């Protein structure tokens, strides 16, 4: 299992590099600085914490060390605070694109930079409060024993309720906001295609510019991909917890399965900048410029 270490560190570094580049890009290219991209930066920094914090946290939890239950709940459940901060941003962004494309005229004055700060703040407030509830007294602990005397060993299915983990953080905090984003995009993709087909059946441009719609929509499709990947990285872990939780009777998920899902989830913080490079000219060009200068 020394390999589960090498891949985690390989992912640790990867995630910090790529995501700092996203933030370096936006700081740098003037065109990149906009509301839609603050939610992307909130998204990148929430992926930098993972490389800096939650992996060292997650590789350390693999030992099963000893520590005070209430300080211990902090080191297992910090990832919850991030994964959840991710989600409010993706959903923020989606709404943004939805408003921008579906209600183009009211947008400029509706969405503003300082209204964007409000969200990002509140979403960080509610990500800690939601992520750390097990600290709020939802602890499963006090009621391998060598540990004793104030120290109780730190494991996930012991101290952290599979109760709150299946119902509250999956059903309520993820499945719901995800099914919400699937809707909001599909609403854009399906609304946009009618607007595009209704410019066809009619002569002359206007009110909207056709070429400039399908250009907005290609970037929306590109922001939705990210959403889909999240589901693909964070779903199995829950699919697996379902099979483990709904049966605190039936058998438990094996070894080479679980760590594979923890990795697979932590993978979520790497691919993002990579999608931007492939799918978005403006980041790809800033990445390129940055890399061929500051790294040259």
């Amino acid at each position: 299992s020394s390999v589960y270490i090498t891949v985690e560190l390989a992912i640790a570094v990867l995630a910090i590099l790529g995501n700092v580049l996203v933030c370096w890009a936006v700081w740098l290219n003037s065109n990149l600085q906009n509301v839609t991209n603050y939610f992307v930066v909130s998204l990148a920094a929430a992926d930098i914490a993972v490389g800096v914090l939650a992996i060292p946290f997650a590789i350390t939890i693999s030992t099963g060390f000893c520590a005070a239950c209430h300080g211990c709940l902090f080191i297992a459940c910090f990832v919850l605070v991030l994964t959840q901060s991710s989600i409010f941003s993706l959903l923020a962004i989606a709404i943004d694109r939805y408003i921008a494309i579906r209600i183009p005229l009211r947008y400029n004055g509706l969405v503003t930079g300082t209204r964007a700060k409000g969200i990002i703040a509140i979403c960080w407030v509610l990500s800690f409060a939601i992520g750390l509830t097990p600290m709020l007294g939802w602890n499963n602990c006090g009621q391998s024993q060598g540990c004793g005397e104030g120290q109780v060993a730190c494991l996930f299915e012991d101290v952290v309720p599979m109760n709150y983990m299946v119902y509250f953080n999956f059903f309520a905090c993820v499945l719901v906001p995800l099914l919400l984003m699937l809707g909001v995009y599909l609403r854009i993709f399906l609304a946009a295609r009618r607007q595009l087909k209704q410019m066809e059946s009619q002569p002359l441009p206007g009110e909207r510019a056709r070429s400039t719609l399908q250009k907005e929509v290609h970037a929306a499709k590109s922001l939705a991909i990210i959403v889909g990947l999240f589901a693909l990285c964070w779903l199995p872990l829950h699919i697996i917890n379902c099979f483990t939780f709904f049966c605190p009777d039936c058998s438990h998920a094996p070894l080479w399965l679980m760590y594979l899902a923890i990795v697979l989830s932590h993978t979520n913080s790497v691919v993002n900048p990579f999608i931007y490079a492939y799918r978005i000219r403006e980041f790809r060009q800033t990445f390129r410029k940055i890399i061929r200068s500051h790294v040259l």
């Epitope: 065109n31 694109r97 921008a100 250009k215």
Partner: antibody
Framework: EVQLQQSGAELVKPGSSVKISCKTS????????MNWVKQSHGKSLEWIGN????????RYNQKFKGKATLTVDKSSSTAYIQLNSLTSEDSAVYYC?????????????????WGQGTTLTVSS | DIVMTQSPASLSASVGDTVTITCRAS??????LTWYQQKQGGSPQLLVY???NLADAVPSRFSGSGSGTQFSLKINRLQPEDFGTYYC?????????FGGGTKLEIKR
């Protein structure tokens, strides 16, 4: 249909002021930044500045700060440009252009629609 | 600030031959370069935006290309309607600036 309809030619004595108007019909006026450009001797183009029609907020090209001041009227849905302390060097054609915006991941901007131009001649 | 400069300042061409005009920004603007076509006594019209993208109902024969500091508009197989002077504009940054234009004239 979208038209930007500019006020007509102006003939002025140096040292005076002028308000050139741009009326926009055929869309929502408050959704887009209005910009003004100046064309001198039917060749070179300069960006004068622009204005957010919703809040009346303006950015100016530095060269034009203090000679040009931009203002709007939402009701009649028209944008203005006023020129002060006019001299011959200000004789040109001033256009209004409507800026346009979308997210490519970057903020894409262009001048969608332009007015017909209005001719300002300063002489003594 | 960011100085835009294009070439050539005048170009004369026969109908049907292909033409490229170039535009060079004094700083790195990525895309954020646009192109305008102005016919004599007319107001400029939008040609290419994002430096690669054609405007609604602009003939496919026009194409933009380039990025960073170097851009070019190329008209394939020129048409009589294409003669006129062409301008580029950068939207990079807060303050914006045009080209000198290039004047496309008929060879005879």
């Amino acid at each position: 249909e979208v038209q930007l309809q500019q006020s007509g030619a102006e003939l002025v004595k140096p040292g005076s002021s002028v308000k050139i108007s741009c009326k926009t019909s055929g869309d929502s006026f408050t959704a887009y930044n209005m910009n003004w450009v100046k064309q001198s001797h039917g060749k070179s183009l300069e960006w004068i500045g622009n204005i957010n029609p919703y809040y009346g907020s303006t950015r100016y090209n530095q060269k034009f700060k203090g000679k040009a001041t931009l203002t709007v009227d939402k009701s009649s849905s028209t944008a203005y440009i006023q020129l002060n302390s006019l001299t011959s060097e200000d004789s040109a054609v001033y256009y209004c252009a409507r800026e346009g915006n979308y997210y490519d991941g970057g903020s894409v901007r262009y001048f969608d629609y332009w007015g017909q131009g209005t001719t300002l001649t300063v002489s003594s | 600030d960011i100085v835009m400069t294009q070439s050539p300042a005048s170009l004369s061409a026969s109908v049907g031959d292909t033409v490229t005009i170039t535009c060079r920004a004094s700083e790195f603007i990525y895309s954020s370069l646009t192109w305008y076509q102005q016919k004599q006594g007319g107001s400029p019209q939008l040609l290419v935006y994002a430096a690669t993208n054609l405007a609604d109902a602009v003939p496919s024969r026009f194409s933009g290309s380039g990025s960073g500091t170097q851009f070019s508009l190329k008209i394939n197989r020129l048409q009589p309607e294409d003669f006129g002077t062409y301008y580029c504009q950068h939207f990079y940054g807060s303050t914006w600036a045009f080209g000198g234009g290039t004047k496309l004239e008929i060879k005879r």
